[PDB]
Amino acid sequence: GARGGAKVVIEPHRHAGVYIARGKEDLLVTKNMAPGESVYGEKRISVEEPPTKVEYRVWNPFRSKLAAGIMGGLDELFIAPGKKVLYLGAASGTSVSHVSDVVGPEGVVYAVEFSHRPGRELISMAKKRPNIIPIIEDARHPQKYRMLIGMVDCVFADVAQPDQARIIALNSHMFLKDQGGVVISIKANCIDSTVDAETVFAREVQKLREERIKPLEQLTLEPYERDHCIVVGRYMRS
Template sequence: MSLPDGVERRSFGGDDEWLATRGEPVYGEPTDGEWRRWDARRSKLGAMFERGMEHGLEGGETVLYLGAAAGTTVSHVADIAGPTYAVEFAARPARDLLEAAEPRPNLFALLKDARSPETYAHVVEPVDAIVQDVATRGQANVALANRRFLREDGRLLLAVKPRSEDVVREPEAVLDEVLETLSEGYAILETRSLEPFHEDHFGVVATRR
């Protein structure tokens, strides 16, 4: 699995190599000149890269990021992508997201609810990729609702947190239900655990049906 253009592995002064992108630091991450470390332990998408998933990203894509939070991952995405639309509902992390967007003219922060894409449909153009990290019940339904923005040949990169769906049942059983619902509008290409970076999380790569 190759990394997208703009993502490299760098040592940052130690023996270990880390994912890295060029850009202004956002969350106190180590830097090496213009490079900033992308820690997969703080990023589901970074973990998908580290786990070798076939993400389909080459760099320069138009991206819709659902669940942008304070901008930790989406700032790295914007470092390597074209127009990047970052949707976050909670006001507190959205303030940090706005700060991350300030030095990135291609990063557009939207204080909206990813479960209601009609509230930002007038802003978001068709995208090459949807990256979703929304820890809420109905994660598959969020992806289905936002499917309208994804180009025919685009990809969904979904981080599934089963404990947000059901804290009692086995994560694998919950994942199966999520995938079943998701398959109503997407063709599932790959599913993989995101451990050891994120316990009880799964990465999913899918395309539009």
């Protein structure tokens, strides 16, 4: 598809900080915080703009669930430039870098991960991106790393755990702003594989509702991913 010889046209996406590369093939794209290097081997689009040479990173949706949400057409993304953003289940910088891209230098990204091995690649990537604050800790006890986190306008959790909802529940109570953002990616197989997906996705919605989270939208991620979806809701403390 996209090749060094090919020329592409970059235009803005409906979401601030998300960009589209037209041409032969229509790419989901973000500005690079650290130009000249690819975090997970993603291809890079470099453009002349008045002339400064701005550099971009391709966002592969098959690799990042959030990007799969973009192409599926999420109505609202609380993740945007100039916002504090808290990320749970941070295996590596495959998606954090792109989230670090959209927030921009002004924003910050709080990355949380539990396993020692995936974390070491995350901290290596955090060195290139000053706006990422890496947290090697279990999300089941947000009290441990309350030390290191301010507020967060939006919490988006990719923890593939049966107890994912509570992990969101506790973190949102600790840090999330009132009327703040909540974006949950769900994989029904982990929490309950026995029952069909549709009943599973309904079940979690009530749990978020029980935790004063008002769900706004949800999106299943085929053809990229099976038995998955992203749920979007707002934190109504009152």
